[PDB]
């Protein structure tokens, strides 16, 4: 009913997890906890080691002629379940399974990246590119032993964030540009309806223009850009538009011009874009566009992995442009965290 379960061969090394998605609050991440039932008669001297790892699998959609391991671990922890207070779920699992139930738990440190999967190109291959978290349990006399997967159970977990309860002030920004006569030229006021938007929710932007110059504007260009700030060995900012709208509206050489534009980012029209940041895949499935990474006020440290943010950019091709930053995120479930049984096309 409640807890997930997975097993691995004769070792009976069945690992139990109460949830697959662990929500992250900007200064406290939900503790990982679980139970790993095992058969001591089979383990004998071998110790039951469980490990949590966050791994960035970097470009191996490029470099296929070098197919090897293109990964770095961002975080690792290990716990010797078989030689911390037990949670209620852990207590219930121990009571149910009995003597051979040995619990485990990990504290994920704050400011690690959330589970984000970079989208494949055509001819997609391999587990993922991007950041994923994994729990595995295995039997060995030492953690340095070479595991051969015979008696190892591996589960992929996700670290996720949900939209904060209180939205901030509506994103408002403006830019002013002057040329030639420069008497009182264009100022480009732009304002979003709100700062926080949910996946599939339209993005509404209000824009104002005052074209008091001899040259007019031919088009009004509105688009939502995903700014995936990547970091591993070097740091980079990839701009991949997720919603784009072109308006042929023109501003006369006059004082005022008003209009409101609505956009809605979705994954159907952005599948072909290789490298687009997507919410971490729990398996070989499909997930929505990556949620904004919320950051604490301490420092936007070059933090490893992918940090995702969104801005809508409004441009006037007389060009005058201004960006409105916003948060694209799921609301807090108020229920069980996982996908809630999205139909499977068996």
């Amino acid at each position, epitope marked *: 009913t409640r807890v997930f379960k997975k097993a691995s061969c004769n070792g009976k090394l069945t690992v139990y997890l109460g949830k697959r998605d662990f929500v992250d609050h900007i200064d406290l991440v939900d503790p990982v906890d679980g139970v790993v039932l095992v058969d001591p008669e089979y383990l004998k001297e071998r110790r039951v080691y469980v490990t949590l790892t966050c791994a960035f699998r970097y470009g191996r959609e490029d470099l296929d002629v070098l197919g090897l391991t293109f990964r770095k671990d961002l975080f690792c922890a290990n716990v010797q379940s078989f030689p911390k207070p037990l949670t209620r779920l852990q207590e219930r699992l121990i009571k149910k399974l009995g003597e051979h139930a040995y619990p485990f738990t990990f504290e994920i440190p704050p400011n690690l990246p959330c589970s984000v999967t970079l989208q494949p190109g055509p001819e997609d291959t391999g587990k993922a590119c991007g950041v994923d978290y994994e729990v595995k349990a295995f039997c060995a006399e030492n953690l340095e032993e070479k595991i051969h997967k015979r008696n190892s159970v591996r589960l992929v977990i996700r670290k996720v964030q949900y939209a904060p309860e209180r939205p901030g002030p509506q994103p408002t920004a403006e830019t002013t540009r002057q040329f030639l006569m420069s008497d009182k030229p264009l100022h480009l006021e732009a304002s979003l309806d709100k700062e926080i938007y949910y996946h599939g929710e339209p993005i509404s932007v209000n824009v104002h223009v005052t074209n008091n110059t001899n040259k007019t504007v031919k088009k009004i260009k509105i688009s939502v850009r995903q700014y995936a700030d990547i970091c591993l060995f070097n740091t980079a900012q990839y701009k991949c538009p997720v919603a784009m709208e072109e308006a042929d509206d023109t501003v006369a050489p006059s004082s005022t011009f008003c209009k409101v534009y609505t956009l*809605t980012p979705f994954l159907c029209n952005n599948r072909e874009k290789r490298g687009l940041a997507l919410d971490g895949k729990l398996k070989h499935e499909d997930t*929505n566009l990556a949620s904004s990474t919320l950051l604490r006020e301490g420092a936007n440290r070059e933090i490893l992995g992918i940090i995702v943010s969104y801005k809508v950019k409004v441009k006037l091709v007389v060009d005058v442009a201004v960006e409105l930053p916003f948060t694209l995120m799921h609301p807090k479930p108020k229920e069980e965290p996982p996908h809630r049984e999205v139909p499977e096309n068996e």
Partner: antibody
Amino acid sequence: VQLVESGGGLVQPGGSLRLSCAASGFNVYSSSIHWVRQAPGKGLEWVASISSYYCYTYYADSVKGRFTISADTSKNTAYLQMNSLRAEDTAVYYCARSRQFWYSGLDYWGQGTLVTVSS
Amino acid sequence: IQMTQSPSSLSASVGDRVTITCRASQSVSSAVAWYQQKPGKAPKLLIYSASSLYSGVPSRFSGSRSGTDFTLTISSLQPEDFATYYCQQYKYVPVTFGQGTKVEIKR
């Protein structure tokens, strides 16, 4: 949130019919639209559904290849195309929606439109 | 997947406790929902996830799961509780509805 439906009528076997359900109070990309059968004196039966966010399209075995479901995001409405209507297609069709990501069952149902096929 | 509701037709009275039950051909996890449909009206969602009451539904309705078997309990009946209740599993694209169970006024 209201799902008003139109297109019900009387048709003969082998004909085609159009069902339109205007969507109000919810977004197509943030919701998944479904169509459900109910034959006279029988239970419910799913026939087709669409998820605009992932632009999926699913149909029942008795409906696969015969009907087609499309959604108009600009007009905020969903259309079901019916072809090669047969005698057993006679049923009341309801348009229902569900949250696009966290399904959580079919929350809102529109007033069904009666579709009858006979010679 | 096939979902068979054991009671094809049920009879009860106001204030009585009614427990509708259903069973699936194979495990469908907690992805089971229950609907209420008055004659001549569209179905109304009662419970989703086989244990979560839909917002605005009376608190008397309650859902339960036992393996492949799912149970709906109406608790203290009311005059508005006499209708047809349908189950549904949505773990797989081929969503299957139950045969339906009618609640009859008993005298």
